[PDB]
Amino acid sequence: IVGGYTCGANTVPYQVSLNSGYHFCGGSLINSQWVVSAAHCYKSGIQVRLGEDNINVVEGNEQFISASKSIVHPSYNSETYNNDIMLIKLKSAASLNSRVASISLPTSCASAGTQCLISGWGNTKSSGTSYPDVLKCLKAPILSDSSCKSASSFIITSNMFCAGYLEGGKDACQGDSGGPVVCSGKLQGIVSWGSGCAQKNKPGIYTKVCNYVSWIKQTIASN
Ligand SMILES: N=C(N)c1ccc(C[C@@H]2CCCC[C@@H](Cc3ccc(C(=N)N)cc3)C2=O)cc1
Ligand SMILES: [Ca+2]
């Protein structure tokens, strides 16, 4: 997260860190047994880390639980990032508490201008590299598709939205991948892609979760 702020320990209790010996992606807890992340975060050997703030220090509220199954969206395309979404089932149910909590799925989509909270342990620099150890947060509005497309020349689909600031300085970044965009209490986005971070006319691109709620619900019910 570039140009954000330190969230405060466990103030985003649905945020998880996916760990394969090191943090490599974010994710969102959606019930005690399931996490939602980006399909581009797919790999084997995922341990889900819940209740984290400092990912390098055991602070006392963590739960580490291995993934039993990962399900990449049936139509994920790794070239275009269309349908950039994946479910991860936990080997054992998380113990839900004030620091480990699920986030509600949308009942409808969010509209341009709605403010959202984006969070993660990704790079905090627009130039070069610095990785934080504590969770970072950013408030950012959804942008209209038309303004996003004209400003950036990005090719996006109806399954993506843009959020952030066209002037630059505030954005998600590498390492935030797979993490939450929460708007008005609902998980509307997943950190998906972009160009650089916090660059002018290059806003963040997010998977449009409202389009996938039916798939999420049916997949969880059947697995
Ligand atoms: N055409 C595409 N769909 C496309 C373009 C570039 C990339 C690679 C890169 C690098 C590889 C890791 C995935 C992803 C990480 C990322 C996340 C957020 C932001 C941001 N909000 N500024 C930037 C980058 C990315 O966009 C992937 C997909
Ligand atoms: Ca920790």
The residue segments making up the domain with residue 206 are: 1-12+103-210
∠ at Cα 163 (205, 208), nearest 5°? 55
Angle at alpha carbon of residue 182, lines to 25 and 5, rounded to 5°? 70
Q: Where are the beta strands (DSSP E) in 75-184?
A: 86-90, 115-120, 136-141, 160-163, 180-183
Are 133 and 29 in the same domain?
A: no
Ligand 1 atom 28 nearest Cα: 193
Q: Please state, in angstroms and as integers, the Cα–Cα distance from residue 114 to each residue in 53, 81, 109, 156, 204, following that order.
A: 27, 23, 10, 19, 15
Q: What residues flank ligand 1, with Cβ below 6 Å?
A: 40, 80-81, 171-174, 176-177, 191, 193-194, 197, 204
Specify whether 109 is located in the same domain as 54: no
The closest ligand to the CA of 168 turns out to be: 1
Domain identity same for 2 and 21: no
Residue 216: helix, strand or coil by DSSP?
A: helix
Residues 122 and 186 in one domain: yes
- Domain count for the chain, please give it: 2
**8 & 26 share domain:** no
CATH number at residue 155: 2.40.10.10
The experimental method behind these coordinates is X-ray
- Which residue among the candidates 119, 152, 177, 192 is catalytic per the annotation? 177
Query: Domain check: are 183 and 112 in the same one?
Result: yes
